[PDB]
């Protein structure tokens, strides 16, 4: 599906900011089962990385690793003119489910239902 250009609205800036805040929880859940944990500095003995900081305190030397492969999906939707509308509610998954008291809040995986627009959007972005 060829795509030419886009004039996006100013509202579409906080999706990518809120992505990493929720993706770092799954990264912590992935790497906590292994022998990886917060520490002082990167070293093979202590099993420390530079990514292992809070989701807000991500260094400038790596930020695009989280934020790259999301926005190139929205071109195929919004260029043809698909919709990304929103209700007035907003924060919903806060209720419905280590420095700084960190720990993951696992969203459920064994519950999902699909329809025309939903399967369409999922297949469009994964495509």
């Amino acid at each position: 599906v060829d795509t030419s250009n886009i004039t996006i609205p100013e509202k579409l800036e906080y999706f990518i900011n809120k992505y990493a805040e929720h993706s770092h929880d799954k990264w912590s859940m992935d790497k906590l089962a292994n022998g990886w944990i917060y520490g002082e500095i990167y070293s093979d003995s202590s099993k420390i990385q530079p990514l292992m900081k809070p989701y807000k305190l991500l260094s400038e030397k790596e930020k695009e690793i989280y934020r790259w492969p999301i926005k190139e999906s929205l071109k195929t939707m919004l260029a043809w003119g698909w919709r990304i509308e929103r209700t007035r509610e907003g924060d919903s998954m806060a209720l419905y489910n280590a420095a700084h008291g960190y720990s993951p809040r696992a969203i459920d995986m064994s519950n999902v239902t699909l329809s025309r627009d939903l399967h369409a959007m999922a297949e469009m972005m994964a495509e």
């Binding site: 999706f15 992505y19 698909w82 509308e85 209700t87 007035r88 509610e89 924060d91 919903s92 969203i107």
Partner: peptide
């Protein structure tokens, strides 16, 4: 993360 986060598309 997109769908049931206070989001509707129609």
């Amino acid at each position: 993360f997109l769908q049931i986060s206070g989001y509707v598309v129609s």
